[model samples]
Target: KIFVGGLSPDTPEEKIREYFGGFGEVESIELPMDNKTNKRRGFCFITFKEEEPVKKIMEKKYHNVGLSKCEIKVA
Candidate 1:
């Protein structure tokens, strides 16, 4: 799994899958929601089918996942 930060609140799960899918198979994506505001948090968690995908993404310091340039870190 990896932590994706600097996401836009409007970013959707499908968009996330599409961007990361370029590296490899995306197993799942978790977009945290704000209970008080009932909106998506500005970050998400992505788990790939294999570690290779993780490594592939980490090669870049940042990625434009949606409307934001997101920072990637292993979680």
Candidate 2:
């Protein structure tokens, strides 16, 4: 799983999946938001269905790919 950050304050889950999809198939994507404001918390989580693709992403240059953070979480 990758913990993505520096996202747009209004970014949505679907868009996250769509964006990350360019790298590989995404098993799960979420941008937890508050029910009150219903706005993005400036971060999101993405889990790849396969570890191999996820590994390739980590080794590749993703930070400059119009996305931010590009950090991975082991969970």
Candidate 3:
């Protein structure tokens, strides 16, 4: 899985899936929510079908999703 941080709360899961999909097939996405706000936290986990995709994304390091610039790390 890839740890994606600094994502905008307004950025939807589909948008994240699409952006990462450019690198590989996205197996699943996990966006943790804030209990009181009932909104997603500023980070998420992205699972890819293969390791290559994670490597590719990590190599890039930084990414743009919606209006936010996100950082990627191996989880």
Candidate 4:
């Protein structure tokens, strides 16, 4: 699993899915939102079927999804 962080205001989930999809098939993504305000938190979790891609993606400083930058870390 990986921790993806630093989301721009109201970043769409499809944007994130598309970005990581470049690395490999994503098993699942977890983006939590505050129900009261219905705004997503700046961070979320991601899991890939293969561990290799996770390592490769983590090699980068960060992933640029659209104009927003998101940090990735092993979780």
Estimated TM-score per prediction?
0.72, 0.54, 0.74, 0.70
RMSD of each: 3.5, 4.6, 3.5, 3.7
Q: What's model 4's TM-score?
A: 0.70
> What lDDT score is found at residue 71 in candidate 4?
85
Local distance difference test, each candidate: 0.70, 0.57, 0.73, 0.69
lDDT of 1 at 29: 73
Q: Identify the leading candidate in terms of lDDT.
A: 3
Between 1 and 3, whose lDDT is larger?
3
Q: What is the C-alpha lDDT profile of model 4 across 2-65, one tens digit per residue? A: 6777644554557766877667877887664555465545567677687887788788748777
Clashing pairs in model 4, backbone N/Cα/C closer than 3 A = none
Q: Is candidate 1 or candidate 4 better by lDDT?
A: 1
RMSD of 3: 3.5
Expressed as tens digits, the lDDT of each residue in 1-75 for candidate 1 is 677775556546687778886677678876644663655445667777878877767877587765677787754
Task: State the TM-score for model 2.
Answer: 0.54
Quantify how close model 2 is to the true structure by its C-alpha RMSD in Å.
4.6
The TM-score measured for candidate 1 stands at 0.72
Candidate No. with top TM-score: 3
Clash totals, every prediction: 0, 0, 0, 0
